[PDB]
């Protein structure tokens, strides 16, 4: 269906100890393909997917220089933002940046985004029109006025609607055997008696891609969310994801409860029932 | 590929 490329940047100040720790990661849909770590020995952007290995050395030179320039800007931002909020010079703070582009099932441009955070809270972000900004507080209005006067959104819009979409299409073509694949979830259910009258029915979903999935429990065909425990979708470590949903049912009525699995890789919605 | 160097806040 739809696809997306996203880049994540994190900078954490170490006051007095030296330069900020900097980690950058790139993803196409749910797959990481590049990384940079300021504490690594290579000091270079590194591959993380087999299909990005096709790029020549000039690719990795340009990507390394650009990602290091990101960390330089964040280093100055950490000093600037400390002054905006009248914070001590000894406290450790965090800057986070995320941007990328979405495309539809026909690989045409769908939307772009570019968001910025300080200490885990929204600071400033580009609007869907890719022409104006959303300032989260009064300190970020100063940045908004600075970025509006410099027409920063015009440069970002050229990347998001252009370069971002063009290389996302290139990545989907070079890695079509893994990016354009759909791994259907392999499902199963477990049963464990809680007490003499209760039982736990856990609905499992393993080794699926992409990560988007839905697990719902029904009592007699009607959705139930009373005693339904649901954990976050987790990575398996091999490019696929895992997820389970559990419910505590009265012992002897397990044949009424049903688990419904919805995933892009399933031609039909799966229905699970404990006998 | 990444975007180019961003403008400081």
């Amino acid at each position, epitope marked *: 269906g739809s696809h997306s490329m996203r880049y994540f940047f994190t900078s954490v100040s170490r006051p007095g100890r030296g330069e900020p720790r900097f980690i950058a990661v790139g993803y196409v849909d749910d797959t990481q393909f590049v990384r940079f770590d300021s504490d690594a020995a290579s000091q270079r952007m590194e591959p993380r997917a087999p299909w990005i290995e096709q790029e020549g050395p*000039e690719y990795w*030179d*340009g990507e390394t*220089r*650009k990602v*290091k*320039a990101h960390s*330089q*800007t964040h*280093r*100055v931002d950490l000093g600037t933002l400390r002054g905006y909020y009248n914070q001590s010079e000894a406290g450790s703070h965090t800057v986070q940046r995320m941007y990328g582009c979405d495309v539809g099932s026909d690989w045409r441009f769908l939307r772009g985004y570019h968001q910025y955070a300080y200490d885990g809270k929204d600071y400033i972000a580009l609007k869907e029109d890719l022409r104006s900004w959303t300032a989260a507080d009064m300190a970020a209005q100063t940045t908004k006025h*600075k970025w509006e*006067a*410099a027409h*920063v959104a*015009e*440069q970002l819009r*050229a990347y998001l609607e*252009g*370069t971002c979409v063009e290389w996302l299409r290139r990545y989907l073509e070079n890695g079509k055997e893994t990016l354009q694949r759909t791994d259907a979830p392999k499902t199963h259910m477990t049963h464990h008696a809680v007490s003499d009258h209760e039982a736990t029915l856990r609905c499992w979903a393993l080794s699926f891609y992409p990560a988007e999935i839905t697990l719902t429990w029904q009592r007699d065909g009607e959705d139930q969310t009373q005693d339904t425990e649901l954990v976050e979708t987790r990575p398996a470590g091999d490019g696929t994801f895992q997820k389970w949903a559990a419910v505590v049912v009265p012992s002897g009525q397990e044949q009424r409860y049903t688990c419904h699995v919805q995933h892009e890789g399933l031609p039909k919605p799966l229905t699970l029932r404990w006998e | 590929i990444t975007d*180019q*160097v*961003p*403008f*400081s806040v």
Partner: T-cell receptor
Amino acid sequence: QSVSQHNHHVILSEAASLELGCNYSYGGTVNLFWYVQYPGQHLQLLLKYFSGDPLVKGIKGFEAEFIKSKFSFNLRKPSVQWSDTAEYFCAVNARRNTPLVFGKGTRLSVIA
Amino acid sequence: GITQSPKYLFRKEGQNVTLSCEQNLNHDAMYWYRQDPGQGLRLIYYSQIVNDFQKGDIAEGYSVSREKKESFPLTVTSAQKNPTAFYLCASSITLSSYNEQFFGPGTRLTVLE
């Protein structure tokens, strides 16, 4: 990474056609610029390729053609005026967090 | 805009001079050039953001510092032995290709014995 402007001095009569060549050695995506320095004035941007139409029209009747396949950004003007007598600089940026690279420049002399 | 050292200035053989360059355009990137006749603009030093500078093509014999956003002073040491030279300062929003450079008026530096 270099930018080549072939002719270093061009002499033209008024109302004649102008054609200043520019080529670059970088092989990736680029942004391209033309700067003009009139005698006794500061260097200023004449036109630039941001994105879109390869035929980029500028001020004072100037036009540049971005030929991506031939790595050229030739500057043209159908009828030079006497006030066009200046030095013209081609410039190309490589989007690799590297500084903008200028050509050696072409001095334009327009016979009054 | 950009304001730099006076259009003309001279030095003595054995003396160092500092050429100033200031901009209130809130730009991150600043540049120093030497305009040689026949070679065009030659990059001496450039600074993409405060506290960060990198050598150009002819950085030999020169020295810079970027302690404030507004200022990018260029110092010409005595090891630089050109009898006359024309220096140009420039700034841009960022080092990004989408940002053109804005140039100062220029400064001719001669050696007056």
